[PDB]
Design an enzyme around this catalytic site. Structure first.
Site, PDB file in Angstrom:
ATOM      1  CD  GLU A  12       0.633   7.622  10.749  1.00  0.00           C
ATOM      2  OE1 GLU A  12       1.271   8.244  11.406  1.00  0.00           O
ATOM      3  OE2 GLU A  12       0.020   6.515  10.787  1.00  0.00           O
ATOM      4  CB  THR A  17      -7.936  12.281   4.742  1.00  0.00           C
ATOM      5  OG1 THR A  17      -7.507  11.246   5.084  1.00  0.00           O
ATOM      6  CG2 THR A  17      -9.502  12.271   4.701  1.00  0.00           C
ATOM      7  NE  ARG A 143      -0.331   5.767   6.749  1.00  0.00           N
ATOM      8  CZ  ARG A 143       0.823   5.371   7.057  1.00  0.00           C
ATOM      9  NH1 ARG A 143       0.966   3.832   7.468  1.00  0.00           N
ATOM     10  NH2 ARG A 143       2.071   6.028   7.252  1.00  0.00           N
ATOM     11  CG  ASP A 165      -1.006  15.351  -0.234  1.00  0.00           C
ATOM     12  OD1 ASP A 165      -0.950  16.201   0.938  1.00  0.00           O
ATOM     13  OD2 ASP A 165      -1.185  14.435  -0.177  1.00  0.00           O
ATOM     14  CD  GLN A 169       6.498   8.766   7.708  1.00  0.00           C
ATOM     15  OE1 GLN A 169       7.204   8.326   7.130  1.00  0.00           O
ATOM     16  NE2 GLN A 169       5.821   8.296   8.680  1.00  0.00           N
TER      17      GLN A 169
HETATM   18  N1  LIG Z   1     -11.121   9.049  12.672  1.00  0.00           N
HETATM   19  C1  LIG Z   1     -10.804   9.703  11.788  1.00  0.00           C
HETATM   20  N2  LIG Z   1      -9.623   9.280  10.922  1.00  0.00           N
HETATM   21  C2  LIG Z   1      -9.238  10.176  10.143  1.00  0.00           C
HETATM   22  C3  LIG Z   1      -9.561  11.787  10.157  1.00  0.00           C
HETATM   23  N3  LIG Z   1      -9.096  12.397   8.903  1.00  0.00           N
HETATM   24  C4  LIG Z   1      -8.204  11.489   8.453  1.00  0.00           C
HETATM   25  N4  LIG Z   1      -8.257  10.312   9.040  1.00  0.00           N
HETATM   26  C5  LIG Z   1      -7.680   8.873   8.831  1.00  0.00           C
HETATM   27  O1  LIG Z   1      -6.288   9.082   9.149  1.00  0.00           O
HETATM   28  C6  LIG Z   1      -5.410   8.134   8.205  1.00  0.00           C
HETATM   29  C7  LIG Z   1      -4.243   8.822   7.669  1.00  0.00           C
HETATM   30  O2  LIG Z   1      -4.685   9.997   6.813  1.00  0.00           O
HETATM   31  P1  LIG Z   1      -3.846  10.762   5.744  1.00  0.00           P
HETATM   32  O3  LIG Z   1      -4.431  11.559   4.850  1.00  0.00           O
HETATM   33  O4  LIG Z   1      -2.932   9.652   4.984  1.00  0.00           O
HETATM   34  O5  LIG Z   1      -2.579  11.335   6.604  1.00  0.00           O
HETATM   35  P2  LIG Z   1      -1.413  12.199   5.878  1.00  0.00           P
HETATM   36  O6  LIG Z   1      -1.353  13.400   6.619  1.00  0.00           O
HETATM   37  O7  LIG Z   1      -1.850  12.526   4.638  1.00  0.00           O
HETATM   38  O8  LIG Z   1      -0.096  11.509   6.269  1.00  0.00           O
HETATM   39  P3  LIG Z   1       1.115  10.982   5.048  1.00  0.00           P
HETATM   40  O9  LIG Z   1       0.189   9.992   4.314  1.00  0.00           O
HETATM   41  O10 LIG Z   1       1.967  12.049   4.587  1.00  0.00           O
HETATM   42  S1  LIG Z   1       2.374  10.278   6.207  1.00  0.00           S
HETATM   43  C8  LIG Z   1      -6.333   7.712   7.257  1.00  0.00           C
HETATM   44  O11 LIG Z   1      -6.715   6.280   7.466  1.00  0.00           O
HETATM   45  C9  LIG Z   1      -7.724   8.727   7.326  1.00  0.00           C
HETATM   46  O12 LIG Z   1      -8.789   7.839   6.878  1.00  0.00           O
HETATM   47  C10 LIG Z   1     -10.631  12.067  10.855  1.00  0.00           C
HETATM   48  O13 LIG Z   1     -10.784  13.359  11.045  1.00  0.00           O
HETATM   49  N5  LIG Z   1     -11.061  11.273  11.847  1.00  0.00           N
HETATM   50 MG   LIG Z   2       0.046  11.943   2.686  1.00  0.00          MG
END
Ligand SMILES: Nc1nc2c(ncn2[C@@H]2O[C@H](COP(=O)(O)OP(=O)(O)OP(O)(O)=S)[C@@H](O)[C@H]2O)c(=O)[nH]1
Ligand SMILES: [Mg+2]
Ligand SMILES: CNc1ccccc1C(=O)O[C@H]1[C@@H](O)[C@H](n2cnc3c(=O)[nH]c(N)nc32)O[C@@H]1COP(=O)(O)OP(=O)(O)OP(=O)(O)O
Ligand SMILES: C=C[C@@]1(C)CC(=O)[C@]2(O)[C@@]3(C)[C@@H](O)CCC(C)(C)[C@@H]3[C@H](O)[C@H](OC(C)=O)[C@@]2(C)O1
Ligand SMILES: [Cl-]
Ligand SMILES: [Mn+2]
Ligand SMILES: [Mn+2]
Lengths: 330, 189, 189
Positions: A12, A17, A143, A165, A169
């Site tokens: 996350e 994103t 998400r 990407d 986890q």
């Molecule tokens: N407030 C805020 N939320 C953010 C920001 N960057 C991302 N998010 C939120 O974080 C949540 C998780 O983002 P995501 O991109 O899914 O994480 P990930 O690294 O890809 O994690 P995974 O999906 O492998 S487990 C989403 O709801 C997204 O909108 C930020 O800079 N600020």
């Molecule tokens: Mg991801």
């Protein structure tokens, strides 16, 4: 020229994103993503209510009436294919309105709660419409965990980019290695704000510390001795808010923050609170100590204060990156 | 510089033939450890001949298992019939050294057609090998094969132009992998 | 080719790899997996060039399994036995290093046993070195049925190891094809 960029980072942290922002920027489907958005909305509410009775001290509703809605939300919690009936939205919003529930939300670090909670809960009436069309921002917030490796292709001024990407986890990290050879650069993502939270994998490992240890693992990797890392200190917006809220202090999770004073070369934003500056930079440096200790000028580290959900902040720093890719002949 | 130079290379459109001894232990419960190694060597000596004839490439030998692959070194559209014929000639080959053994020695041919990734691994004692799911599958045809016949996959039948005659091998019921992977096997007649 | 009276054969495989192998377009078709294996093997081969393992002989690599032997460098007395064991620990120490850097959790399985073996070469086209005998598959089966991070050794093997200052736990019995049911032991660390 093609530059294969790998996105690495904990769970996350915001990896997906950024790839989103890349389609936003350099690249009828929205229909299928409405479901996923509703699914988020459901998890958000049902999680907060759940945590109320388990937190210590527990959390009481401000309106005993709502108990029934609480009983409702829970009953349909594990339902397979939810119809998302009209009532649901009413019962959902109701609870959100409940001051006690919000009190519990404020203590969301004490349990696992997806980021887009508040955002989506605040537009129940919007999302409930059956003529509802997701805004780009909503999609940025949607998400949905990524399991496996996904490659996205784009082009910037005729310069090709192959973005990879992966899952952040722990169980997923074993797939990363399949992209360690012939990679151009690593964009390591970090959830700056999560300094007062723990990962889902055990609910005990601090999330920030997990990022650090993970970064260290990539930096000092036996197959990345040459690769430079573009460190994204993401979720700045959340961090700032947290810092200004003053509720949970950073020095309480990372005491070393107590010895910290802000740097000289520190360039704050226009009208940026000194405490926020002092914090986000403290965080950055924690990652720099990791990169400084080793590497031997074989590879380098490039920090960036970011906010992935912000298409502007992202169009900005991404160019800062396009440069270093060119400028460094990578 | 980062990873040791990998001497590996992909290869599409090929035929992979595996072959093992039907009940090799029963075989060993009779003759001297030496005589086995001799019968073995004897066989594969004859095998390696047929191989270079049938346009195949011996890959490696593991006791009673011989696996070569048509489709190398240079790509050949005729890659399927080679393995088949190879299987054919192998069938009789083993049958003739059964005379010397004076014992029930027999084979089990399995052939699947697809793509591989071949080369050699490690740094020391190199040995040419092939790697792929199709290669794993070819191995499972040899396993879920039938004594004395040729167990070819549906892919090996599509590069064959059916000049040969097959029949349900029902390998799915003779091997777990073939079943779990909905594989339609056949047997050259 | 000649025979020996006491060679210490060892088989070490990584079951967890077969699953790890993924032929996806992203990983260039299991190539990146073979690349990660190439490292693993390359790493294990580096052990051979040491001072204490100067008596180990990598024989061949089958699949993800490493096959070495000790005692071939001859015409207290079974030091090469404990040596083949010390080499297992080496392989593992090296495997847990890769994991650290591949965010993976691979586990080796070992099978060590000795006894007479027939060394030599087979295959006529390009001949390759290999040792034969019951002594061999027994150590092999000690692996195919062993346990992760455990070395399964026959009783004879067990006995000596203890004299060599080792402790061992009786796994129990195992149905070694052709040799019936044998009593194996695990080398407790
Ligand atoms: N407030 C805020 N939320 C953010 C920001 N960057 C991302 N998010 C939120 O974080 C949540 C998780 O983002 P995501 O991109 O899914 O994480 P990930 O690294 O890809 O994690 P995974 O999906 O492998 S487990 C989403 O709801 C997204 O909108 C930020 O800079 N600020
Ligand atoms: Mg991801
Ligand atoms: C008393 N046994 C022997 C005496 C002299 C020479 C060989 C043997 C012997 O039976 O060796 C076995 C392995 O060491 C040996 N072997 C396997 N792989 C290798 C290998 O890679 N190298 C060497 N040297 N030997 C190997 O071949 C044999 C096959 O074992 P499998 O478990 O694969 O049985 P099977 O092939 O399925 O036949 P089965 O009875 O069901 O039908
Ligand atoms: C290395 C990966 C993978 C998946 C690829 C593959 O095609 C194999 O190497 C073959 C089939 C293949 O290379 C032909 C030889 C042999 C000896 C039959 C191998 C083993 O069964 C391997 O299993 C082991 C033990 O890893 C297997 C199945 O493993
Ligand atoms: Cl993180
Ligand atoms: Mn056999
Ligand atoms: Mn065999």
């Amino acid at each position: 020229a093609t530059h294969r960029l790998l996105l690495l980072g904990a769970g996350e942290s915001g990896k997906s994103t950024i790839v989103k922002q890349m389609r936003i920027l350099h690249v009828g489907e929205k229909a299928t993503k409405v479901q996923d958005i509703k699914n988020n909305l459901k998890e958000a509410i049902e999680t907060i209510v759940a945590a109320m009775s388990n937190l210590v001290p527990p959390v009481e509703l401000a309106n005993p009436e709502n108990q029934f809605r609480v009983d409702y939300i829970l009953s349909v919690m594990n339902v397979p294919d939810f119809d998302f009936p009209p009532e649901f939205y009413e019962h959902a919003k109701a609870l959100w309105e409940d001051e006690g529930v919000r009190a519990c939300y404020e203590r969301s670090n004490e349990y696992q709660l997806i980021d887009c909670a508040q955002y989506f809960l605040d537009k129940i009436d919007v999302i409930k419409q059956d003529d509802y069309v997701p805004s780009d921002q909503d999609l940025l917030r949607c998400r949905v965990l990524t399991s496996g490796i996904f490659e996205t292709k784009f082009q910037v001024d005729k310069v090709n980019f192959h973005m990879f990407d992966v899952g952040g986890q722990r169980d997923e990290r074993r797939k990363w290695i399949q992209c360690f050879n012939d990679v151009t650069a690593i964009i390591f993502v970090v959830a700056s704000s999560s300094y007062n939270m723990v990962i889902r994998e055990d609910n005990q490992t601090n999330r920030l510390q997990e990022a650090l240890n993970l970064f260290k693992s990539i930096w000092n990797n036996r197959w990345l001795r040459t690769i430079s890392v573009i460190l994204f200190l993401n979720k700045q917006d959340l961090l700032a808010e947290k810092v200004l809220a003053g509720k949970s202090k950073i020095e309480d999770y990372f005491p070393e923050f107590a010895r910290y004073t802000t740097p000289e070369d520190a360039t704050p934003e226009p009208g940026e609170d000194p405490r926020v500056t002092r914090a986000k930079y403290f965080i950055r440096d924690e990652f720099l100590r990791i990169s400084t200790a080793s590497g031997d000028g074989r590879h380098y580290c490039y920090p960036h204060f970011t906010c992935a959900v912000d298409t502007e902040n992202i169009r900005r720093v991404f160019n800062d990156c396009r440069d270093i890719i060119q400028r460094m002949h990578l | 510089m980062m990873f040791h130079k990998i001497y590996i290379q992909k290869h599409d459109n090929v035929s992979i033939l595996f072959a093992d001894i039907e009940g090799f232990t029963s075989l060993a419960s009779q003759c001297t450890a030496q005589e086995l190694v001799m019968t073995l060597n004897e066989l594969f000596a004859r095998f390696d001949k047929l191989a270079a004839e049938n346009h195949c490439l011996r890959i490696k030998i593991l006791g009673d298992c011989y696996y070569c692959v048509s489709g190398l070194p240079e790509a050949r559209a005729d890659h399927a019939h080679c393995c088949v014929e190879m299987g054919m000639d192998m069938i009789e080959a083993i049958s003739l050294v059964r005379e010397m053994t004076g014992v029930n020695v027999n084979m089990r041919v399995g052939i699947h057609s697809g793509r591989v990734h071949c080369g050699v691994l490690g740094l020391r004692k190199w040995q040419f090998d092939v790697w792929s799911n199709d290669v794993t599958l070819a191995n499972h045809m040899e396993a879920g094969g039938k004594a004395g016949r040729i167990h070819i996959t549906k892919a090996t039948l599509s590069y064959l132009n059916g000049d040969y005659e097959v029949e349900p091998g029902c390998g799915g019921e003779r091997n777990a992998y073939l079943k779990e992977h909905s594989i339609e096997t056949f047997l050259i007649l | 080719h000649q025979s020996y009276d006491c060679v210490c054969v060892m088989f070490a495989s990584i079951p967890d790899f077969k699953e790890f192998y993924t032929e996806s377009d992203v990983n260039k078709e299991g190539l990146e997996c073979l690349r990660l294996l190439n490292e693993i093997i390359a790493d294990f081969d580096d052990l051979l060039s040491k001072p204490k393992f100067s008596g180990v002989e990598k024989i061949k690599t089958i699949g993800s399994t490493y096959m070495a032997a000790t005692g071939l460098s001859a015409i207290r007395q079974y030091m090469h036995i404990g040596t083949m064991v010390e080499f297992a620990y080496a392989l593992v120490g090296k495997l847990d290093a890769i994991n650290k850097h591949s965010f993976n959790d691979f586990k080796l399985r070992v099978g060590i046993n000795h006894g007479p073996v027939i060394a030599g070469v087979i295959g006529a086209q390009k001949p390759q070195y290999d040792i034969w005998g019951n002594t061999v598959n027994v150590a092999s089966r000690m692996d195919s049925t062993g346990v992760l991070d455990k070395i399964q050794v026959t009783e004879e093997t067990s006995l000596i190891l203890q004299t060599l200052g080792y402790t061992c736990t009786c796994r129990g019995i195992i149905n070694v094809k052709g040799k019936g049911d044998l009593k194996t032991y695990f080398v407790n660390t």
